[PDB]
Symmetry: D2
Subunit: 499 residues, 4 copies
């Protein structure tokens, strides 16, 4: 409908979304059902490409795509992205509706993602801040005298953008934007569970003038994508997902430029001098936002003895005063989780914590195949490390609360999980803050706020199991671009007179 006018095929009741094969929308591979977490019903179908079509798509992106993307001057790429922003913006409601239906995202959360995608597109201009090379004079070494060097960046060619389910619209728009702004062609591979927003975005981009042979959207399920990652024409792979899949991706890909945003949870530390209202409010939000289905969600709260009581109490009040329902009621605070499987795991993890000495302070009640109350489990420092909610990432609205003696204990506990994406610290003392910033092994630390990557105005990425490299405005250039050095030799040519 609308954007996907002549694209969506209305086959026997359910709308069928085809893959975009770098030139034409189509696909002759298996058809796959797409369901809503709101009622487990099949809301549409997607056509996956055949091995022959995947192969043909890659051949196109590699042979023509790289050149039409690279040979379109930046000023036009910028215009394409801005026009794509205009198109998505006027279709805001439709984009939002699909997010609410397909991802079970609360209405306002879905509207936020569309706006984030629109802004990312419009701010492509800011990505230019990291454009420009280095001039290296050669008279600072005898061996390089009368020599000179120029270093600049060049697009790698074809970038594979693999995307998660929790931000089906933004991640696709993001990776496409930074890959394309520098001159690359892109193969987008969305989560097969909610590939509709990506299809809509790509259509808006194509309508905006995005070189038709420089982009692709393949509805491939899981391991079917390995075919793309393992191919030599794919010079870079931008992957946002789970640690386990990310690992499999590199082992399949081999030598190549990578950006691995592998998430995991995020710990939050509250110091005795923190504004507890701000902290309680922000931590509660960081715990339940989009049913905790955020990589930058808060999964552990560590508070110093003196404020632990109030803090945990306040966060508990907030979490239980939440309304869990269908994402449509602008009254509902929390919608469903992407699958009943996800809820099972959350329940199991809560039982595990309880068995190991944990006590539920809020939530805990499952309300349906895909509905649960955001839960807050208190745990003694001496037992938390063996709890599943600690050792692992339970993608759900659930966090642990742990009392700590001082900053050092907070820090060692915060660093005790295998991940290191972000960390939040609420407090006022510059010294304690500086110490925490140095010792927290994470890609980013949020001072007096909950972790929120937003559109990447500030760069983010992981450490430890959370991955490698960063995404951000300007910073993502390092992942879809390679350096090119030009060394000029003027030895004895009389440019310099011994210097």
């Amino acid at each position: 409908a609308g954007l996907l006018e002549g694209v969506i095929k209305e086959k026997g009741g359910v709308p069928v979304y085809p893959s975009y094969l770098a030139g034409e929308w189509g696909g002759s591979g298996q058809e796959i059902e797409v369901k809503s977490p709101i009622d487990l019903a099949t809301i549409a179908k997607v056509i996956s490409p055949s091995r022959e079509e995947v192969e043909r798509t890659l051949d196109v992106l590699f042979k023509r795509g790289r050149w039409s993307a690279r040979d379109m001057p930046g000023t036009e790429r910028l215009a394409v992205l801005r026009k794509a922003a205009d198109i998505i913006e006027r279709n805001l409601d439709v984009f939002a509706e699909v997010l609410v239906m397909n991802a079970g995202k609360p209405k306002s959360a879905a509207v936020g993602e569309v706006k984030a995608a629109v802004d990312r597109l419009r701010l492509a201009e800011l990505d230019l801040k990291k454009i420009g090379g280095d001039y290296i004079p050669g008279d600072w070494t005898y061996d390089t005298l009368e020599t000179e060097g120029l270093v600049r960046r060049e697009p790698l060619g074809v970038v594979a953008a693999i995307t998660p389910f929790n931000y089906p619209l933004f991640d696709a728009v993001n990776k496409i934007t930074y890959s394309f702004i520098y001159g690359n062609a892109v193969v987008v591979k969305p989560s097969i569970s909610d590939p509709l927003p990506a299809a809509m975005a790509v259509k808006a981009l194509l309508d905006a003038g995005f070189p038709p042979d420089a982009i692709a959207l393949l509805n491939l399920p899981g391991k079917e994508a390995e075919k793309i990652v393992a191919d030599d024409r794919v010079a870079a792979v931008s992957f946002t997902g789970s640690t386990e899949v990310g690992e499999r991706v590199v082992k399949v890909g081999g030598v190549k430029q990578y950006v691995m945003e592998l998430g995991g949870g995020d710990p939050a530390i509250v110091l005795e001098d923190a504004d507890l209202d701000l902290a309680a409010d922000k931590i509660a939000r960081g715990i339940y936002s989009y049913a905790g289905q955020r990589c930058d969600a808060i999964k552990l709260v560590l508070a110093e003895r003196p404020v632990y009581g109030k803090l945990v109490e306040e966060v508990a009040k907030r979490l239980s005063s939440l309304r869990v329902g269908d994402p449509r009621d602008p009254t509902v605070d929390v919608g469903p989780l992407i699958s009943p499987s996800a809820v099972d795991e959350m329940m199991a993890a809560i039982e595990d914590a309880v068995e190991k000495g944990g006590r539920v302070l809020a939530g805990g009640r499952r309300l349906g195949p895909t509905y649960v109350q955001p839960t807050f489990v208190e745990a003694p420092a001496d037992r938390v490390k063996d709890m599943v909610l600690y050792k692992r990432e339970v993608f759900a609205p659930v966090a642990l609360a742990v009392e700590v003696k001082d900053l050092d204990q907070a820090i060692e506990l915060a660093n005790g999980r295998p991940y290191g994406l972000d960390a939040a610290v609420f407090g006022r003392d510059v010294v304690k803050i500086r110490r925490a910033v140095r010792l927290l092994e994470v890609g980013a630390i949020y001072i007096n706020d909950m972790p929120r990557h937003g559109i990447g105005y500030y760069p983010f990425g992981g450490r430890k199991k959370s991955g490698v490299f960063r995404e951000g405005i300007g910073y993502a250039v390092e992942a879809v671009t390679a350096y090119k050095t030009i060394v000029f030799n003027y030895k004895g040519k009389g440019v310099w007179k011994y210097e």
Copy 2:
């Protein structure tokens, strides 16, 4: 002897070099013979560590190494490196002798490598040019108003430095320098065929004060190293080697920060307006230097019709007027190749070129198990692409000569090999040069000079099969360092008044 005073064990005639286990020199694993390519004789032995020692070494580097390297202020790390430079410099002759004997490197070439290693150490100060973070103000987006960001770099922890045989001293010193200057611990794994210089370098570094638990040298053969690369305590892997091993390394390593210098040959392009004396001289040198056992060696020469004759003729004269012998005679220009196996391949490749229409213009005669004449094979443009000397990298003193109609043919031929390390272009016209610089898919282009990475004053690395990422003074920081973002929230705190 000297540096390796109480380290080398004189066991029944041949000196035995032990591995350095992050604290003590030792090893209780198999012993391996080290031979000279000059006479196939066993000149020494190296003790490899046992699985238990490898494991224990990693535990040390990870638990104590990262902290003693990171907690040694930069000013002291700098002093350590400078003192290490002094030590190697006064032991220049001994270092050189081992290179000549162990790697078959011509005396002056071995002396050059020692001096390169000394300079790299002394210029660690220049690596600081890429130290410093970014301050990102937040009033350039409504969502980030009254917000602020700081981005800086942090050492990853433990870096594994895997090294090739052709620059056994420099590569080890290089990777150790840039890994350590930023606060990392290092596990060095030298080629098991010539691990002596690395052992000497590490000793000089340890003598200079390099934190004893922050460095390691393991004499592990090939696949025995996979154990190190696959370990989670190894946050980065700096690998310089063949495309094939590099690929295996990443597939074993998984998600991690990588620098892959995978070589391959380098094409050289001569334009009709080039200074043929300079070009002939530089190309000849780029072909035979260290028996072509240089990743940045010239493997293909492409000259435009009008100068092709003179050029090829002059380069042929130069190559055949070369003296091939024992690397010791300062009179010998070319020493042996690292193994008879290497010579076999060169011979096979020359026969292949000849069978496919190629003609030998210089050299071609094998002089012994590990000795050969640097060879120059002319080939018609219409047949060169299927020749082994073209499709592959024959690590030996051998290059192809191909006449071309114009710049575009030179460029497509130059880009026709699977590699893309460097490329040389000799000419004068800025337009033709600019075109070639844009279209040559290589990490670096050398204008009017032969490709020579030197000590990395200018950054270098590959494209296509030549690998990913770069090494260089200042630039290598990006491979052994990770970003850390600190976002400060002052919303409503009165720092700004709506701005």
Copy 3:
């Protein structure tokens, strides 16, 4: 009319433009006539402010202006500039008409300036590339251990933008843009000879939402402006004008941040390997464009013996085939000069050159009080240096042609004038080009093109008598901004453990 709706006062026949006093349009000082160079007729009048109003305007800009400009977040400043671009763009024809009438600018040249002003405003986003501070860690010196540093930029406060007559619209828009984008208030002082475009631009900016107390436009004549420059509330002075006035400005201003674009002519060098069609075409244009009333105009042509003949001949053909008339006929190539005084000087300078051995190769005929033929005077190298057309800048469509033996003579002659704004060099050889780039003492060198600052996509400014500092997208930040260093002390606070 239109923009200046309720602003322009229709007093007895001629439209009267008032000054903008940081809040209200007005002025109670002397009225001054504004004439057209097309017919010496009074086309309007401007109201200059009284000493009391100047004083009051400064008090406003300083006390309220700095804060309303600084406290308007960048994202809004950007919106203001973009909206101002929209307003000027829809009023393109009116803006152009005033330029043609008030400055005698050829229709297409006037249209170009309006478009340049619109683009400058729209690209303010690119100025952000030089936004961001430096983080300086302190462990690289013993004295600074456990210490840390942050360096960033801060707006100076009130910037005085003084403008020339030859780009009455662009210079005003330019200085206002870069001054405002970083948070400064601005006092614009246009040339009293053509202050109408500035008034229109300021109105478009005010309509766009530019903080009303953060900007000012004072119609002050020459020395009347000294009052502004000498004031302590004016933290920076951005001056584009003649060397002589610039000098007086600093001597009146004292200690303050300055940008002095003082022009002078530009020499052009043609090498024997240059494309003479390109060179002839570009040099001819650089000589006559806007009647040579461009600071980056070509005033001297130096060609090597072998191409000198053709080149000079071709440029002569082009200059004489030019149509001189009223700037309105899109058929006229060259309009009038800003004043009859300017033509007198050009005539005197041509006679001087002739008396000193020069020969006219094209032009030379005066056609009216303010009309002349763009002139090309050939001069022997041994006599050119004493000619007025060489030693001085004759702001008119006139250049000298000098034959030279080689590059070195071209370079010494090019460096022989007292100025050093830009220089053009046409040729192909990288070596000769590199030499010329190193030895030409000018702010910018244009390779194979005529000097053209455009909107400052590339930064420009002078050397020698041409001034100091630079203007450009991103670069101008250095002139209206100051550094602020924050040094944090954590000595003995346990952030670091000796490091």
Copy 4:
């Protein structure tokens, strides 16, 4: 003696130091007596150059100096500076003795300055961090398509370094270092009151190989220097001194690149959450160090009601427990002031403060023509602004103490003086600190430490009356260097295919 072996002329009892005239030590102008503030005795004499010698020196620096400095590759300039560091270091005691005798500097303070000068010289390598140009691609604007830009820095030529009396050794070494490291020649003009250290430093530099025609040391008194500043061959003027002289310097110099470090005092703010021991200790030191003859000396202390009592009390104890004597006793804490005139002013200023409601809390007693007790005067907020000790900079060991209600009052008082060099803030709360950092109009803010420029590891400079631009490692490049832009035109040359 020693360094000044054949330089110092022993004329009738007192050693006579000649000026260095860019090639030979000499001078045929008036002789001037140099006295010690320790006993008002004439300890030596300096020979000033004659107008003819000044003129000849400038001609040399301009015609040969710029080229021998610029044509000495950086690697050698670096060696010169390092060798100069070695020479000064072995002559440490002699250098220190002259400082103690000639400047009345306490033994340990004099030793610190020599060590600072040695380090500055040795760290010249760090100044390279800001070396390197920018490559600007042209496809981000239609007008600049197929165009390209390179921006780099170039030395200005001859830099005039004018120096104060309070750091006669360091300032001279500093300005010489950053001016020379980039390729400039230098004219040093030391304070005629203590020009001996400069002479010694220049000798050490000349001995180290500093191009003999690229440096000069002229013993000119005050206005005699104007001759240098006003000259066109002097492209930049690096001046550290009083606001009043700085102003005169620019008005005499005209258009030129400037760095004006004009000092003034520094306010210190203590927040209720500050570590009062640290603050008391650091503020006391910032007040008395070198008899307050430091531009970064603390002249005003502002403490919040709750800690004001303890703080002021503790600082008073510290100041009065100080030993005032001859700088030689390593037991003496405070030596004399440079002149009896300076003490008179301090006394007058203290009486003024007292008359206006101020009360002395420590010191106040003059002990001789050039000796005084470091004084601490308490003043009510409602009267301090009219006190001389507030409105002006009394170069002496004297500061005001003012109780304030909150941060905003502290900030407005701190910003109330006409200067804005540095500011210190002691406290712990990030919010209050961030606010103070934003609103303090000074070049640098020191958090939890006294203001101390040191060797400029962190850049510093003024705002308001404290001057313009910055000095620092890396940052000073902006003052003795100019940009050079090279724009290459490839329009229609086939480098790009519409991009």
